[PDB]
């Protein structure tokens, strides 16, 4: 359905672009505070290998790098981006989309654990490097696991969340690099208030050191629905 924000990175060609917004001039669709002192190029890097190839809307993607110097609020590693609107993210029945992928360069300690795509209060989100299944990416809603996945190298993990602002449940549709999204988490019940800017759009993870880690991230919007399965074209399909 409609487009209710627009997260596409077309219009973000270097680094510097996320740094034009500040919070008396909040420009574009990212708010851009949550992050260490480095300048933006150590955190966030964008380019045409970094998206989901079957996105073909898309110029580009985002790499999202933590390291040791990325600490905002504490010593936890963290590089996030919020988005900026206007509009309300947390009324009715709202579509999350984001795909994410790892590679083998910098690749996510499966041993730590990591906080991902997840709104302030941590009602749904993604984990790695916990419970069972470290090496798994998991979704989360209410505080349980309800779905994961082998975060394999290279493979782009196409996500959206179906959150029912209404009767507070969230459920999730996923599906790998050109395949459209299906529904392999009904709804359960979550807290699923948002003040339509507490939506992280990164990574946090807990333990601070070295060596950095990339998370790739593209096609990243909020939809009505009915939900929009298909990924970019779908000519990868």
């Given at each position: ?111 730590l ?39 394999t ?61 990339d ?13 929009t399965?298909?990924i ?6």
């Open positions: 359905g409609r487009i209710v924000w627009d997260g596409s990175f077309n219009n973000y060609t270097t680094p510097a672009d996320f740094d034009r917004w500040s919070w008396a001039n909040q420009v574009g669709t990212y708010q851009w505070y949550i992050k260490g002192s480095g300048p933006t190029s150590r955190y966030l890097n964008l380019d045409p290998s970094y998206k989901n190839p079957a996105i073909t809307s898309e110029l580009r993607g985002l790499k999202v790098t933590i390291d040791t110097t990325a600490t905002w609020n504490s010593q936890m590693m963290r590089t996030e981006l919020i988005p900026q609107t206007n509009a309300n993210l947390g009324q009715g029945n709202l579509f999350y989309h984001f795909s994410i992928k790892r590679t083998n360069t910098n690749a996510p300690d499966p041993t654990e990591h906080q991902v795509m997840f709104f302030e209060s941590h009602f749904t989100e993604l984990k790695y490097g916990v419970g069972s299944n470290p090496s798994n990416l998991g979704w989360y809603a209410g505080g349980t696991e309800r779905w994961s996945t082998p975060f190298a290279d493979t782009w993990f196409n996500f959206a969340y179906d959150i029912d602002f209404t009767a507070k449940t969230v459920g999730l549709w996923a599906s790998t690099n050109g395949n459209p999204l299906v529904k392999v988490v009904q709804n359960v019940p979550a807290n699923t208030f948002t003040d339509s800017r507490d939506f992280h759009v990164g990574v946090l993870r807990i333990v601070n050191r070295n060596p950095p880690e998370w790739y991230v593209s096609g990243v919007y909020i939809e009505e629905g009915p939900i399965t298909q970019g074209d779908g000519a990868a399909a």
